[PDB]
Amino acid sequence: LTRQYSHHSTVGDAVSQLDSQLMDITKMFGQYADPFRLSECKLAIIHCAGHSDPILVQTLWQDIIDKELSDSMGNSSVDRMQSLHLKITSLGKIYASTPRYFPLEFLVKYLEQQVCNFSWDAGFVTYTMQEINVPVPKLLEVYDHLFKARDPWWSRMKKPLHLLESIYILLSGYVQEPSKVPSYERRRFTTLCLDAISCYLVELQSMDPAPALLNTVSNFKSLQAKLERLS
Amino acid sequence: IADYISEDMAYLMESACCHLQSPERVAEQILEDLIANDIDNIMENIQNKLQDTRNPIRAIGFLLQNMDYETNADMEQPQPNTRLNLSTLYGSITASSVVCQAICKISATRFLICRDLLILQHLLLRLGDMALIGAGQLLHSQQELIPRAAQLLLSYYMIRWGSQCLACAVPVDILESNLQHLSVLELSDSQVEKRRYTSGIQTIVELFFEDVARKHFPHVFIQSGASQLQEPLNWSDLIKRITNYLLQLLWPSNPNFQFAECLMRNCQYTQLQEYVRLLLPWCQVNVGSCHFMLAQCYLVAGEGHKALDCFSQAASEVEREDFLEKLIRVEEGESVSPRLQYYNRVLRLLEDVGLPELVIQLATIAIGEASDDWRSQAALRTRIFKHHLDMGHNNQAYDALTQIPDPSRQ
Amino acid sequence: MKQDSASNATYTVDCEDYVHVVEFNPFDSGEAGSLLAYGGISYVVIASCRFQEEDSTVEGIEFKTLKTFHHGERVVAIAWSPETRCDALLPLLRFATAAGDKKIRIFTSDFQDKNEYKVIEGHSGYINDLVFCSPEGTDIASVGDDHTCRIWDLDGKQIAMFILRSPGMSVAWHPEGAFKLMVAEKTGTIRFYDLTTHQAILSLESVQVPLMSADWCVRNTLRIGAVAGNDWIIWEMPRSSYPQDNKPAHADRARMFRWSKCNENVFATTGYPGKMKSQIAIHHLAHPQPILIGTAPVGSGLSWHRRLPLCVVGGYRKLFFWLTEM
């Protein structure tokens, strides 16, 4: 409130009330977090209260992302990407241990839509989720689901290969550093990657031959031949 | 004629237009009822006054011509550099409603004129060789003028209906998602200027005016000789020009099809279904585009089988209609048939909605049109294989696999 | 030995009375939860259902009774009005029931104090099915053992009547077409009517009899599905008056057929209530066998969730839900 609403006439009174006593979570939510649209504080409140609404959690994460993207509108594309990365990494490190408050599939989907909207690096979401300590196998499961869901959004945005580009970056990072996956599951995970790549190659062959598609097919064949050396 | 039409006879014509009955046959029935009830020798008074007319065919042709807003397709695309000062002309909600009320009134008055004119044309046919100097020219010219008056009646009924039809209140999140789905179709060049939908009731014509027609008014102002930014604004000339231009854009035979496109973009599916229902039986200009829009409305309604039938009907007219041609022009790739490009677009849309059975039915039809391109056949058969496998139809997936012409994809 | 691994219901909810019919609201009520109605011996219960598959804040199923209406008679069929909205500043609950007394009742409620019902009389036989007109919500179609299909306004005035050649078994409005009505007759004939012209447009004939239930596919208005004798039957219009598919549904007769509201290739059938258990079979057109087989004690009603691939059947004092993969 002091940082973002210093010019608002009611904030002096709100800050003095917040000093004057310890408040209950219900009062903090309804009298301060809601009127001032403090979506990070709302997320912390519902986490502390053990209150779990998946729709509310997704809406709060959306509001946090959209606010960070709005506050950074005056900055360069790289600085906007870095600001959002630092924001999502900071909150992700708090909530990623508690899946009820870290809706990973929604976050990956929503951030990949923003990467497409702003024409950012396709590596951005995969890098940010790995820095949060999201396990590479769990992140691949989410991307595999998002790809198999065949969302018409990607075709409407003229970016039908985007999720496969993100998958290629994720798996290329695993091939470069196989220590990102615990040694006890590495063999099983490499087999799952070979099976998944075989499925992606069959689906890519069913699409119209474009230069971008032929490059994606070449990248996945190269990735397959590198994973076969790791198995 | 107008002074003797009862409320029941007026309702009978309006009901006939709503139910897609022949307005000619209904004008003949109203004329039978008028002759049966001719207590005041009015048919004799109309006959005496028609004898004062030297050329009734020329007078009818003149009325129909001044009531015709059919546009020859030369609406030149806008030069970019004069946009910034005139984009806000007539941009207020008050001006929007005054212009749309002008259309409502013009279409209502001209609907009555077309009704009364149709009744008069049937009276002229019944009066026959006994009363007017021109036996052979009257019968042959009335065969061309009656269908034209009927088409104008239906066109003014449609514009009147649209000027009275309320737009549905659509949540911004559903509109933004529909615009994302339509952007996948490339049906949207327009950035969402953050329009706070001013939460007023609007007609579908008020909605069309604000969204589409408004952006073209600066151009209509410039083309008409106002190359001097110094002419004083005249209300009387400007309202007439705006109203005539908006009538051309709302015209059911307009090849630009922008009215139906605007309804689809604003999620007005119920009004678009009713508009297409009222249009398809008698207007042949945008039949494919109507079936494509209707197919999208059925897809949103969850009626995927009817959507597929309508998409298959729309595929026949894809080369004739400018709106369907816009859906094709963006794949700068080698010699694919325009129908196969259209089916590839509809297949992407059925996949995004998650309807695998309809994707297989459409992909099977699309293989029939792909007769010469083994690469497109390989892609379509790979798609059929994937969806049968995902559904667990193991035998059909295996059959689809044996038909793949590409050994690498196989 | 193939042990028919009858799947347990994904969810089960206990009811205060016997369930004789159950229907999900197929319309948008603007609430996050799906509205459900079930009819008992003398009551209609209106409930909200939320599922973990649509809402990550729910563990399993959240079932909340919103209102119980005294009906006095055994409910046979329920139809939702498309005007039903719960998120509005003035909530409107409207539904129609058909009952053992051969009457239709239209219930209207604000979920508060305003609870009114209108009784519609005129059927001389049992009413087998009833539906609201979807898109306008102003008209009710009903069919029965008096060999009539009747159309009613909300005022209970008969607007139209079609004389049938046998008992009318099911009725459905065209999903996109305010004047197109499907009527399925017990002798296997399915007729399409236009209410503007008062004419039959077309008919289909089932390869088996009696026809017991038919449904119009909302996702594909060319598809009609029915159950007749022991089989389920699918037609694709306008291509043929002959069925596209005819396959065994149940050994001891099929009773109900309903299309999924979210998938044009998925439908459910129910067997005739035997002495102890009714079979439920979920089918997908790409598969020669049911994708799921369930059982309910004396299965009563069959309805589909609006968005999820989830169906419900009433049985004894319980609702049973089956989720299928898409």
Side-chain angles (χ1 to χ4, degrees), chain C residues 9-35:
Chain C
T10 311
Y11 309 109
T12 300
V13 173
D14 290 320
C15 304
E16 298 184 343
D17 196 16
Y18 289 90
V19 186
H20 286 309
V21 57
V22 58
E23 286 295 355
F24 275 113
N25 181 17
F27 308 112
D28 224 306
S29 45
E31 277 187 4
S34 282
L35 293 178

Side-chain angles (χ1 to χ4, degrees), chain C residues 155-270:
Chain C
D155 277 315
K157 184 188 175 187
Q158 193 183 280
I159 303 161
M161 178 182 74
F162 305 100
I163 303 175
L164 310 181
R165 295 188 178 185
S166 79
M169 295 303 309
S170 191
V171 57
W173 291 95
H174 184 284
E176 307 175 337
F179 306 111
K180 288 179 185 176
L181 190 74
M182 184 189 78
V183 177
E185 299 188 70
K186 191 173 184 171
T187 51
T189 309
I190 306 177
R191 297 181 183 241
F192 301 92
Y193 294 94
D194 188 319
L195 283 142
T196 299
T197 67
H198 297 282
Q199 290 179 1
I201 302 159
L202 186 54
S203 62
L204 308 171
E205 302 298 342
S206 65
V207 291
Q208 294 203 30
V209 296
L211 182 158
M212 291 302 306
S213 170
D215 196 23
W216 204 329
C217 187
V218 176
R219 295 296 299 154
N220 185 341
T221 57
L222 302 184
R223 288 182 180 172
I224 308 297
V227 282
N230 286 2
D231 292 8
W232 60 254
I233 308 171
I234 305 303
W235 299 256
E236 188 180 331
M237 304 308 289
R239 299 188 190 226
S240 184
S241 55
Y242 300 97
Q244 177 180 2
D245 284 289
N246 178 43
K247 306 191 188 179
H250 299 288
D252 295 328
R253 307 176 177 175
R255 181 179 176 202
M256 228 62 74
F257 182 103
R258 292 294 201 190
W259 285 108
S260 172
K261 305 311 182 191
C262 70
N263 187 333
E264 67 174 313
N265 299 312
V266 177
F267 60 94
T269 65
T270 65

Side-chain angles (χ1 to χ4, degrees), chain C residues 290-315:
Chain C
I291 58 173
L292 184 151
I293 300 178
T295 66
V298 194
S300 293
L302 172 65
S303 199
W304 283 95
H305 190 278
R306 178 178 161 95
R307 299 181 185 155
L308 300 175
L310 183 146
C311 76
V312 65
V313 175

Side-chain angles (χ1 to χ4, degrees), chain A residues 149-220:
Chain A
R150 297 180 179 190
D151 190 331
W153 188 102
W154 307 109
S155 298
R156 184 173 63 216
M157 291 297 291
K158 305 180 179 178
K159 292 289 189 167
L161 303 178
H162 183 72
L163 295 180
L164 287 176
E165 187 172 6
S166 303
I167 289 163
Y168 169 76
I169 293 167
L170 179 63
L171 294 183
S172 294
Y174 169 58
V175 167
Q176 287 175 359
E177 191 176 73
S179 46
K180 291 183 173 188
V181 179
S183 54
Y184 66 79
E185 65 175 12
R186 193 182 293 147
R187 183 175 180 162
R188 182 180 68 124
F189 184 59
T190 301
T191 304
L192 288 168
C193 297
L194 289 170
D195 294 334
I197 290 171
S198 300
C199 291
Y200 305 149
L201 284 172
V202 172
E203 293 204 340
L204 283 169
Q205 286 170 15
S206 75
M207 299 179 80
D208 292 315
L213 183 131
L214 295 176
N215 191 48
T216 302
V217 171
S218 187
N219 284 348
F220 275 104

